[PDB]
Structures are given as C-alpha cells and as structure tokens.
C-alpha cells in the first residue's frame, strides 16, 4: 500500500513447495528480463 | 522365456519417495495421522 514509495512494514511468509532432492547448492544467479519504457532492447 | 525383472533399488542415499480409516468423533480413542500418533477424544473445532 503506497505511503511513501518504499518497501517497509511487518511481513509474514509461508511455505509453498518442497522438493526432497538431497544435493547441495552453493551459488546462484537470476534469469533477468529486458524491456524499455540488451543490445537492441534495453532494461 | 520369462519376464525376469532384476529389482534393484536405491536405499537411503536420498530422501525417500516410494512410501486410512473412518473419522470417529467424541470418543476416547487411539488415532494416527499421516505423521502424528496419539490417543484422545476426537472432536470438531
Ligand atoms: C555438498 O556441498 C559441497 C560444496 O559445494 C559439494 O562439493 C558436494 O558435492 C555436496 N554434496 C555432498 C554429498 O557432499
């Protein structure tokens, strides 16, 4: 809810899914997106 | 000739993947859910 433009407040989160896989992960990146309001279509 | 399936299986090197009665209300009964056991009086809250 817009008060002044910034994320702050009392938040609560819940579980969604679990995968009992059993391996380790030590790195990550994130698949980003590009769109203009990235050599030809900027971000 | 016979269908003879060599039945190997992975055992406890990973979290397991290969693994009911009627509801009775208002009686001092034993119970057991999917994970949890117990003995009480089953009601409706
Ligand atoms: C656990 O994490 C380490 C660190 O990346 C990794 O090298 C290893 O393969 C993982 N799995 C086991 C079973 O140790």
Q: Which two tokens stand for residue A40?
A: 């030809």
Beta bridge partners of B40: B29
Strand partners, B31: B38
Residue nearest to atom 1 of ligand 1 (CA): A24
Running DSSP on this structure, what letter comes out for residue B41?
E
What number of CA atoms fall less than 13 Å from residue B32's CA on the CB side? Answer: 2
Technique of determination: cryo-EM
Structure tokens at B2: 């016979």
Burial B7-37 (b: 16+ CB within 10 A, else e): eeeeeeeeeeeeeeeeeeeeeeeeeeeeeee
Neighbours of A22 (CB within 10 A): 8
User: What does DSSP assign to residue A33?
Assistant: -
Torsion angles phi and psi, residue B4, rounded to 5: -110, 105
Is B17 touching A (CB cutoff 8 A)?
yes
Does the beta carbon of A24 sit less than 6 angstroms from any atom of ligand 1? Answer: yes
CB contact under 8 A, A22 and B15: yes
């Amino acid at each position: 809810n817009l008060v002044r433009d910034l994320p702050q407040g009392f938040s609560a989160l819940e579980p969604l899914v679990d995968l009992p896989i059993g391996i380790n992960i030590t790195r990550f990146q994130t698949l980003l997106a590009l769109h203009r309001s990235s050599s030809g279509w900027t971000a | 000739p016979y269908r003879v399936v060599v039945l190997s299986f992975e055992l406890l090197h990973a979290p397991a993947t290969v693994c009911s009665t009627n509801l009775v209300k208002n009686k001092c009964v034993n119970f057991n859910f999917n994970g949890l056991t117990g003995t009480g009086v089953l009601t409706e809250s």
